[PDB]
Amino acid sequence: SYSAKMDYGKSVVNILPSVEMLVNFNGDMTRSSKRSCLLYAERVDFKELLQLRLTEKSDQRRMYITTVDSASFQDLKQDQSLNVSFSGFIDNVVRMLKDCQSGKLELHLTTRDQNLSSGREVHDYYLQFVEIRSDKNLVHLSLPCRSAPLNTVLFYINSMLEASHKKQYILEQSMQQMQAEINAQRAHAERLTTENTNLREALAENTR
Amino acid sequence: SYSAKMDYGKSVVNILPSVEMLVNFNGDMTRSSKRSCLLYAERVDFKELLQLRLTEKSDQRRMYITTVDSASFQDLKQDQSLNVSFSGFIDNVVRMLKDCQSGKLELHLTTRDQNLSSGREVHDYYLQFVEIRSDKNLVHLSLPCRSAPLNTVLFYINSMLEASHKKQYILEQSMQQMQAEINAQRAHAERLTTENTNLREALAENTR
């Protein structure tokens, strides 16, 4: 299947550092679940394009992707009566993700209520930012979310693997240039300090 | 898309440590190529099952899998006039892989010559162990190789990522305490040189 990949190199901007988040899975609390996920939020610098990736921590192959561009954003702006520009939208989204971290908000992943007569749609989920209230819970933003197809998933997990390997290389080489200190400084310490243990005996004969 | 996955837990045995290998891609040297690959060789302990995985170093999503079980092994034994048991076969394959490492042998990945009128097959390649000779090159073993389907590739790359994460956590957690330890223990100079620099002067002053 087809899905937007954020393969834009240096133009990819992390709008928020990747974090672990407790996410709600679906509507009815008797049939729902709360799972530990990993959220990745990034945009493109040269064009209006935002992608939010949600992975289940236990199996990052379980990926849910939300991609909103200019047109999509216009549809969202109309449907949800948003009073912001694309940049202000990004600001709001970031802010709300941080609120979901602090617990001020809750991130939900709701199955879209589908049936045979409503035709067919690409997005089978909604990524919702919900405020728990004592009168009625309030949904601040509802984004069309998709179950990532294998090609895209494989792209992100492969990329993550490569990044992990590069990081391991940087770590082990940052250890390697430092690993000379552990073989030089203790060899300068435990073997050459004996000239001090024997110097006191030299001082002993001329101590009076 | 189906392919055998070595998801047999502790029963999975590395018959050979994962290594980098230069592999030949296809027959006619005017249309062939030589690429750096990573070879993974593993078997199951409780049943006769061998899998060789070949990934292109530059992109491990490019995966070629050879899976041999009992029946398959009987077919190879007949067709190639092999005079060994399954265990002895595993021994020979390991030996030959080591020889490919040393340069005594060459590992080829040859496209099977297909056309519309021939019987359709799942395996579109041959993993061949070729001995370069001055009379005529000799092919010691020819295994039916398959181009790994997405599901399987995603399984192995995801697995590799998880293992990589475990390795990173173990590495940096074992590294940080020594990065502080070298900063506490390097002072051993300034800690013992007061006992050294003033005692050299005491010894200079007593026999002055």
Numbering used by the authors:
A (entry chain A), B (entry chain B): 9 to 216
Please quote the paper that reports this structure.
In initial attempts to purify Sas-61–241 the protein invariably formed large aggregates (blue trace) that appeared to be elongated chains of protein by negative-stain EM. It has previously been shown that a large hydrophobic residue in the headgroup is essential for the N–N interaction in several species, so we mutated the equivalent residue, F143, to Asp. Purified Sas-61–241-F143D behaved as a dimer by SEC-MALS (red trace) and aggregates were no longer detectable by negative-stain EM; we conclude that aggregate formation is dependent upon the N–N interaction, and the F143D mutation perturbs this interaction in vitro. To investigate how Drosophila Sas-6 might oligomerise into a cartwheel we solved the crystal structure of Sas-61–216-F143D to 2.9 Å. The asymmetric unit contained a dimer of Sas-6, associated via the coiled-coil interface. The DmSas-6 N-CC dimer could be superimposed with Sas-6 N-CC dimers from D. rerio, Chlamydomonas and Leishmania Sas-6 (average pairwise RMSD 1.87 ± 0.31 Å over 617 ± 47 backbone atom pairs). However it could not be superimposed onto C. elegans SAS-6, which has an alternative head-group-spoke conformation. Furthermore, we found that the DmSas-6 N-CC dimer could be modelled into a flat ninefold ring, similar to that observed in crystallo for Leishmania Sas-6. We also examined the structure of Drosophila Sas-6 and confirmed that, similar to other Sas-6 orthologues, it associates via two self-interaction interfaces, a C-terminal coiled-coil dimerization (C–C), and an N-terminal headgroup oligomerization (N–N). The interface between the headgroup and the C–C was similar to that seen in most other species, and different to that observed in C. elegans strongly suggesting that Drosophila Sas-6 assembles into a canonical, flat ring structure. In agreement with previous studies, we found that mutations that perturb the ability of Drosophila Sas-6 to homo-oligomerise through the N–N interface in vitro (GFP-Sas-6-F143D) cannot support efficient centriole duplication in vivo, and this is also true for mutations that perturb the ability of Ana2 to tetramerise in vitro (Ana2-CCA-GFP).
Centrioles are complex microtubule (MT) based structures that are required for the formation of centrosomes and cilia/flagella. The protein kinase recruits STIL/Ana2/SAS-5 and Sas-6 to a single site on the side of the mother centriole where they assemble with CPAP/Sas-4 into a cartwheel structure that helps to establish the ninefold symmetry of the centriole. Here we show that Ana2/STIL proteins also homo-oligomerise and that mutations that perturb the homo-oligomerisation of fly Ana2 in vitro also strongly perturb centriole assembly in vivo. Thus, Sas-6 homo-oligomerisation alone appears unable to drive efficient cartwheel assembly in vivo if Ana2 is unable to homo-oligomerise.
